[PDB]
Design an enzyme around this catalytic site. Structure first.
Site, PDB file in Angstrom:
ATOM      1  N   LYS A   1       0.073   3.749  -2.796  1.00 19.75           N
ATOM      2  CA  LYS A   1      -0.919   4.749  -2.778  1.00 19.75           C
ATOM      3  C   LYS A   1      -0.756   6.042  -2.827  1.00 19.75           C
ATOM      4  O   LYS A   1      -1.403   6.797  -3.206  1.00 19.75           O
ATOM      5  CB  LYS A   1      -1.871   4.409  -1.418  1.00 19.75           C
ATOM      6  CG  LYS A   1      -2.710   3.231  -1.585  1.00 19.75           C
ATOM      7  CD  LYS A   1      -3.337   2.685  -0.125  1.00 19.75           C
ATOM      8  CE  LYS A   1      -4.410   1.839  -0.365  1.00 19.75           C
ATOM      9  NZ  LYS A   1      -3.606   0.401  -0.810  1.00 19.75           N
TER      10      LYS A   1
ATOM     11  N   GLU B   1      -5.351  -3.184  -6.975  1.00 23.83           N
ATOM     12  CA  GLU B   1      -5.607  -4.053  -5.824  1.00 23.83           C
ATOM     13  C   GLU B   1      -6.603  -5.161  -6.014  1.00 23.83           C
ATOM     14  O   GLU B   1      -7.604  -4.826  -6.843  1.00 23.83           O
ATOM     15  CB  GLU B   1      -6.326  -3.095  -4.732  1.00 23.83           C
ATOM     16  CG  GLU B   1      -5.265  -2.061  -4.148  1.00 23.83           C
ATOM     17  CD  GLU B   1      -4.138  -2.695  -3.144  1.00 23.83           C
ATOM     18  OE1 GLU B   1      -3.494  -1.850  -2.841  1.00 23.83           O
ATOM     19  OE2 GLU B   1      -4.461  -3.916  -2.936  1.00 23.83           O
TER      20      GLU B   1
ATOM     21  N   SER C   1      -5.651   3.226   4.264  1.00 25.96           N
ATOM     22  CA  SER C   1      -5.180   2.228   3.314  1.00 25.96           C
ATOM     23  C   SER C   1      -6.533   1.486   2.840  1.00 25.96           C
ATOM     24  O   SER C   1      -6.465   0.320   2.739  1.00 25.96           O
ATOM     25  CB  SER C   1      -4.379   1.374   4.135  1.00 25.96           C
ATOM     26  OG  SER C   1      -3.102   0.811   3.240  1.00 25.96           O
TER      27      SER C   1
ATOM     28  N   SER D   1       1.731  -3.278   4.253  1.00 22.43           N
ATOM     29  CA  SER D   1       2.278  -4.800   4.514  1.00 22.43           C
ATOM     30  C   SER D   1       1.430  -5.628   3.461  1.00 22.43           C
ATOM     31  O   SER D   1       0.329  -5.544   3.067  1.00 22.43           O
ATOM     32  CB  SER D   1       1.813  -5.326   5.760  1.00 22.43           C
ATOM     33  OG  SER D   1       2.601  -4.535   7.073  1.00 22.43           O
TER      34      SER D   1
ATOM     35  N   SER E   1       1.021  -1.118  -0.116  1.00 29.62           N
ATOM     36  CA  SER E   1      -0.171  -0.001  -0.193  1.00 29.62           C
ATOM     37  C   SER E   1       0.932   1.162   0.036  1.00 29.62           C
ATOM     38  O   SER E   1       0.385   2.357  -0.261  1.00 29.62           O
ATOM     39  CB  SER E   1      -0.868  -0.034   1.077  1.00 29.62           C
ATOM     40  OG  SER E   1      -1.980  -0.616   0.934  1.00 29.62           O
TER      41      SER E   1
END
Ligand SMILES: [Cl-]
Length: 262
Positions: free
Chosen positions: A47, A140, A104, A211, A44
């Site tokens: 982002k 994603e 996130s 993560s 992430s």
């Protein structure tokens, strides 16, 4: 110093994994680097680049951040803490940016990606800034596989630190857009156990964690130490085992090592 290098090598050895660090100290334009040209899955932390690409686009489209985006059941992915509350309504691009950066939210990331044209467009934005290392390959949630040796959805610590410096302290974005990115990152809710945990309580941090697979545990931050010029710090970490657990403490330890003194 060799001392800092020895300490980082010791931390990496003790952790069992592979550690990547890049610190830029804007006080003297110096760097501390460890595996800083190796590739790590971003998770992430990507982002930030997607939200920055939307901000850049908004410089020439003043209605852009207010544009509404429908959230459908078919948009849900693996981790949707904000978007799941808005199914069958809309969210603005500003709200999606905040959700991506501060919680996130992976639906939010996918909407930022889709808006600018997809992963290759996010990557082309990085290239326009002078980052020839960043690659966003997938959306994603598949960008999280983090298979060792796979270059998809990776960058290097050096590249991400230099780009984050440009985005948050430099002139990649217009003044309004830069301030918005910094405000969003300073309002992150997910970073207290990572870089922040290795810095004095008084220091101010804007960061984005991530993560993902193989116990990959990452954080990228802009840092305002008390009465000092700002720092940029990237700490990337990944492990040999597919189901390894996150090690945010390793990122905290690396942050403490590289900022001791300061
Ligand atoms: Cl395993």
């Amino acid at each position: 110093t060799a001392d800092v290098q020895q300490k980082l090598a010791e931390l990496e050895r003790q952790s069992g994994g592979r550690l990547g660090v890049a610190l830029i100290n804007t006080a003297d334009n110096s760097q501390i680097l460890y595996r800083a040209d190796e590739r790590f899955a971003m998770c992430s932390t990507s982002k930030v680049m997607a939200a920055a690409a939307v901000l850049k686009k908004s410089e020439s489209e003043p209605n852009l951040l207010n544009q509404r985006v429908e959230i459908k059941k078919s948009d849900l992915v693996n981790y949707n803490p904000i978007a799941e509350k808005h199914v069958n309504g809309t969210m603005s691009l500003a709200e999606l940016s905040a959700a991506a950066l501060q919680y996130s939210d992976n639906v939010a990331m996918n909407k930022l990606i889709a808006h600018v044209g997809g992963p290759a467009s996010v990557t082309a934005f990085a290239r326009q800034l002078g980052d020839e290392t960043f690659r966003l390959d997938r959306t994603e949630p598949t960008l999280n596989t983090a298979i060792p040796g796979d270059p998809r959805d990776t960058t290097s610590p050096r590249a991400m630190a230099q780009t984050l410096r440009n985005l948050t302290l430099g002139k990649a974005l217009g003044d309004s857009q830069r301030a918005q990115l910094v405000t969003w990152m300073k309002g992150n809710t997910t970073g207290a156990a990572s870089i922040q945990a290795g810095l004095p309580a008084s220091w101010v941090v804007g960061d984005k964690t991530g993560s993902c697979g193989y116990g990959t545990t990452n954080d990228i931050a802009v840092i305002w130490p008390k009465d000092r010029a700002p720092l940029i710090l990237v700490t990337y970490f990944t492990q040999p085992q597919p189901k390894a657990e996150s090690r945010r403490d390793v990122l905290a330890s690396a942050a403490k090592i590289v900022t001791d003194g300061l």
